[PDB]
Amino acid sequence: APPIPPPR
Amino acid sequence: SHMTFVALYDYESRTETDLSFKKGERLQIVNNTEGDWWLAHSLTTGQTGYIPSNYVAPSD
């Protein structure tokens, strides 16, 4: 599974 | 324009406003698909929260 996008 | 997606991978929430979901859940966009975090509603679990756009594909 990929890393998350830049967080909120 | 796509408003229904399917989870490709399990996602565990990382903050409380995230939506946790399992692979294979259908996820309905509540508002829009701008940016990387989408407010979505699981058609499987009924839960609502933000999902990471790279974890889902259009329900094809």
UniProtKB/Swiss-Prot annotation, chain B:
Transmembrane segments: none annotated. Disulfide bonds: none annotated. It is found in: Cell membrane; Mitochondrion inner membrane; Endosome membrane; Nucleus. The phosphorylated form is termed pp60c-src. Expressed to high levels, and with a high degree of kinase activity, in certain fully differentiated cells such as neurons, platelets and macrophages. Isoform 1 is widely expressed. Isoform 2 is expressed only in the muscle. Residues 4-60 form the SH3 domain. Non-receptor protein tyrosine kinase which is activated following engagement of many different classes of cellular receptors including immune response receptors, integrins and other adhesion receptors, receptor protein tyrosine kinases, G protein-coupled receptors as well as cytokine receptors. Participates in signaling pathways that control a diverse spectrum of biological activities including gene transcription, immune response, cell adhesion, cell cycle progression, apoptosis, migration, and transformation. Belongs to the protein kinase superfamily. Tyr protein kinase family. SRC subfamily. Forms a complex with polyoma virus middle T antigen. Interacts with AFAP-110. Interacts with GJA1 and PXN. This is Proto-oncogene tyrosine-protein kinase Src. The lineage of its organism: Eukaryota, Metazoa, Chordata, Craniata, Vertebrata. The chain holds residues 85 to 141 of 533 of the full protein.
